[PDB]
Design a protein around this ligand. Structure first.
Ligand SMILES: C[S@@+](CC[C@H](N)C(=O)[O-])C[C@H]1O[C@@H](n2cnc3c(N)ncnc32)[C@H](O)[C@@H]1O
Length: 256
């Protein structure tokens, strides 16, 4: 009943035609996975804010345990499950609808919680704090998050982020937050520029051309499309100042 309700409609439509809905690459997903040493055929893994599950399918192909993708948008989960079905993976890979502020898991159920380009929806620290209970002792969190690369920056890019997601922070500050939340910062690495360009903005042009033909003349859709363009423009102009960082973190008692 709001522009926002109609908005979610567009977002889903727009991004449904992309293999990923945020910066990343199969190489990056597997690099993060390479730091996790606890997994077996009996492991239970969840991917939070999984989108259509592009990264989840990569993960699933390189682990033997069960993987559950969770996302707020049923349209994304329908695609997730369609793709798992195509790959014959449904014995191990399942997509479910849910909200990351209200996860359905039992305490200490999971060996691994994955989340790429999604924790910002509840906030980095909040996710670190609230998701901890769902992990087995010695289990892992592996999340990619928006980062500043410097302490000072141009007003334009600062203002953009203060409006979009003011919890963006520098990497040393973020590593400190991992530690403070009771996790050992086992690995922390910055995503390459190609995760943003080749693997996200570039496929986004094809998706945008499909979206615009479908929603031609719709005011809200054209606005939404303009915002997407701005996002890419800002990245090309300010990429020296920000990016994504992958944090792989082990839940340990010694840190709380
Ligand atoms: C930029 S996308 C990335 C999707 C995917 N993880 C990737 O890396 O391609 C953010 C995802 O978070 C989901 N999302 C937003 N708020 C959520 C919430 N409260 N609970 C669960 N998922 C949420 C969106 O629907 C979307 O699929």
């Amino acid at each position: 009943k709001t522009i926002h309700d109609f908005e979610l409609n567009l977002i889903c439509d727009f991004f449904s035609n992309m293999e990923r809905q945020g910066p990343g690459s199969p190489e990056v997903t597997l690099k993060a996975l390479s730091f996790i040493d606890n997994l077996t055929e009996k492991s239970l893994i969840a991917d939070i804010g999984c989108g259509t599950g592009g990264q989840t399918m990569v993960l699933a192909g390189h682990v033997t345990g069960q993987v559950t993708g969770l996302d707020f948008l049923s349209g994304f989960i329908d695609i997730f499950n369609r793709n798992a079905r195509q790959s014959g993976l449904q014995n191990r890979v399942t997509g479910i609808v849910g909200s990351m502020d209200d996860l359905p898991f039992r305490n200490e159920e999971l060996d691994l919680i994955w989340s790429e380009g999604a924790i910002y929806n509840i906030g980095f620290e909040r996710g670190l704090n609230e998701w901890r209970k769902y992990l087995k002792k010695g289990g892992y969190l592996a999340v990619s998050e928006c980062s500043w690369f410097t302490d000072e920056r141009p007003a334009e890019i600062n203002d953009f982020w203060m409006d979009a997601y003011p919890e963006i922070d520098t990497i040393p500050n973020q590593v400190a937050k991992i530690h403070k939340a009771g996790y050992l910062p086992v690995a922390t690495f910055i995503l390459p520029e190609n995760c943003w360009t080749d693997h996200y903005f570039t496929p986004k042009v094809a998706a945008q051309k499909i979206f615009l033909t479908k929603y031609a003349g719709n005011k809200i859709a054209e606005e939404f499309s303009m915002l997407q363009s701005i996002e890419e423009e800002l990245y090309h102009k300010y990429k020296e100042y920000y990016g994504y960082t992958f944090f792989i973190a082990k839940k340990i008692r010694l840190l709380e």
